[PDB]
Amino acid sequence: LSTGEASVVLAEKIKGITQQNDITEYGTVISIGDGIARVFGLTKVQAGEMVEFKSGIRGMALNLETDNVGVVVLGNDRDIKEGDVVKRTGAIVDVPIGEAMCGRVFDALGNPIDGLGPLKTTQRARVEIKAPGIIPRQSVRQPMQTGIKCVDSLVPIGRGQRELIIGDRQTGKTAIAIDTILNQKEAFNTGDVKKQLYCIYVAVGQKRSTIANLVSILKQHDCMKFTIVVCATASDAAPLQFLAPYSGCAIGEFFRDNGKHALIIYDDLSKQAVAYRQMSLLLRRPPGREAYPGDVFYLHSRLLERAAKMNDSLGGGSLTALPVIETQAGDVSAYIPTNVISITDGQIFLETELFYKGIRPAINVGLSVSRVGSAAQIKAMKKIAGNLKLTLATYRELAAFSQFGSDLDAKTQQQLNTGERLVEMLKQNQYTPMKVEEQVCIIFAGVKGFLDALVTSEVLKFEKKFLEHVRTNHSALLKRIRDSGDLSEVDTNELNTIIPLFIQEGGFKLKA
Amino acid sequence: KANGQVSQVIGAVVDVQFEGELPQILNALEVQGTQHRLVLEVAQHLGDSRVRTIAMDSTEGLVRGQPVVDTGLPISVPVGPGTLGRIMNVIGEPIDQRGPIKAAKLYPIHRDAPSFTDQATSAEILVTGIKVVDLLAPYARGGKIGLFGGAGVGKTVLIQELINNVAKHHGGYSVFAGVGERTREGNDLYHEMMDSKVISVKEGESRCALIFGQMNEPPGARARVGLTGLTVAEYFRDEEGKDVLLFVDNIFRFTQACSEVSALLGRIPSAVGYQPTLATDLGALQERITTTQKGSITSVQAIYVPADDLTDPAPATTFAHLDATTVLNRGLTELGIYPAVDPLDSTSRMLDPITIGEEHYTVARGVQKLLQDYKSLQDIIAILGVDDLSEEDKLVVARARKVQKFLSQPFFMSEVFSGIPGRFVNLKQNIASFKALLEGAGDEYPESCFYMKGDLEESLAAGRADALKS
């Protein structure tokens, strides 16, 4: 397009700008405190409708009472005063959606806080919308590669399911989310739209310094080009923390209804329940157990239930949710964690003991489970994934006899050692995602028992050296496993022959 | 002509202001001017021509003063064969997108349970194909069945197997009411019944009804959608003396949904935050699900145990209404045994030497005592081990493990997870298989073969095959 042609269309567009104003009812605030505004009059107002105060801050009309109206201040309520004017806009809460959202950082309402420039978007969708029915959905049959060995192998995540990252404070809950976003960057560079996965990170009740560090890492690795960050900090009012999850969720529905694939990551929802509890308590509503409202279960269920795999008739899009939950002392019997577990499909339990014993990612495979199961894994993964689970299961049993000692059968020593190789194999550093095809090779060498030769302390470094050796010399092998997605017999013989060979080639501690 | 009008809207509770002739409680009110059909169920009369109702659809978009029409009758849903093989909504709307539902007439979802004089209770063994169930906790045709399970224990997959094994080849019709569960499972079951030919588009077929109250629905609807499915089964029962198979998904969501609005309704929270009317609300539903002179209903309802705490008020009260009980244990899943049916906690009212054959009753208790003894030995074995035990105790632990592992049975619904084709076990082969193990028929072979097997003969054949292989 010539520069002159584009400029003319630009000028013509600015010419066609309409602005209509109609009579909007207004009311006076009977009282204001803790962000709750009781409004007099202002009748014929819809539930959840948007209202604007004198200063210019918005509000959401939640409680519609015969006497007054309970409105929540969507911002700082210092300027609000008794008798101030409140104008109803006439539209339910909504947020801007589109492709321009990628590469920016917005708040709960959707305003960009990066400071770069205004948001250039024309599509706005309602924050709260009914979830898809039963027919629009579709069986989850596409893998969502997170880049973690233990996850992609033991707890496979298929595009369209709901996996719960549950754990205690400083257990690596955020580390898992970051590693997933970094892994999807490679698929974004290559021209494979069928595997591109837009990442959405919802920050609820988190210090801005941490989010600032989070965004810098994405830019460092160049993974921010396809990431959307919604920020609802602690200083932000409770309604903002309450709407930020649904706000970001609506942004994901855009890619969903457009046949695209989007990944939304909800941070700790317990903070939302506190903000939702705070918002409910201040409205003088009857509290339930643990001071939370009665319909707190409906909150997370309504939010998570939207994530689904749309059928091919609507474009085949999918939205994957990875809600996070922070536990106080590892007690999963609490009210909120129990509910979230029953809502999501699978859950990833993080243990503090495993974290300090060197098992990072500290993943408890005994409890973690996924409904999709092998239905999402690739052919080359299901075959090796099945045997991996059985081997790890036995190792956990023999763990006790290790203390007993005083004797060890020939096979038990092998099973004990073999399992130790897998545990040492599944370990992974931070900010180091691995490709799916590379994992198949490493995970393969473990179950076959080749890792039993070299010392355990040399298994982690062997992984790096082995993968590098493969990428250089054995490049056609990786291509077949990637394109076909299956581990043919020819690859098995070649792979089964080089793994014992390479161990003898490199300089390692062969003495088991 | 609308007599009422919206006056107060908070969350899911909506109050209507009527001028005269207030609607009776439980009546269905139609709000005019909504983008989607909204129905309000009268629950309380607050005086001054005020009524408090619960919304079945999202309350977003309502407006104070919006006209409300009085139907004069409770929520009526379409009944008859037209609902067979079709998904229906809490208020009777077809959400399957296959068109309107044809019903000979409309029945209300609220009705009085059948009298006591016309109860007509009867016991009849139900061969479900599961050996662990048919042996320890036999089911009675026409009696309630409870599947107590925690979060992610395998109760949902077990329901699918019962349908695959019981629903098909059934002369009568079947009803499936899924309340509060995720919608993903609903789409899978719908496609499953379609592929399995349980449901089809061709009229005159699909002898099975589906009702869904999944999470996507707001409160109030999840608490009454269960009644909708029951009305469909009641129609097939009274109008036709045909055995109806009612497959109810997790029911804890019903009592849970009531508590979500019990606070706003004005009730004081209970010991665990539930509504004070938990017992009565549950009793009105359980009493309606029973066999009568006209027809019989075999209801398979699952009870979700939050946090694996069986002392919760909701499930505790349900035990009193159930005929057969199936308590799922999480420990078994860790061991890999499926179905993870707790043999000690699970009980069945049919487990009586007079009701069932004495041989069946004898083998049942023989296994229970064997497992109970093995459990006590676990304590001493942890410190001393199996070697330090006596020859008598060693045999107890040996056979106990073989019996415990032999309880595991792979079903068709678990093929995708395990990869082994499902298998059906008859009652005769089931009793004979365990009876032989109690006598020591399989004490010689390793305990590895008595795992995920259908019949004892299959285990022995696998044992010999492993020998020639090595």
């Binding site: 006790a400 006899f401 007993f404 059968d409 | 074995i381 199996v386 390793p446």
Partner: peptide, 27 residues
């Protein structure tokens, strides 16, 4: 602080070792 798990693992561990040898003799 979990001693119940300690006993549980000890039970499964030792029982497996004992019967694993018996499985060999049985075959």
């Amino acid at each position: 602080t979990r001693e119940e798990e300690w006993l549980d693992k000890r039970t499964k561990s030792q029982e497996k070792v004992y019967f694993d040898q018996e499985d060999r003799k049985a075959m």
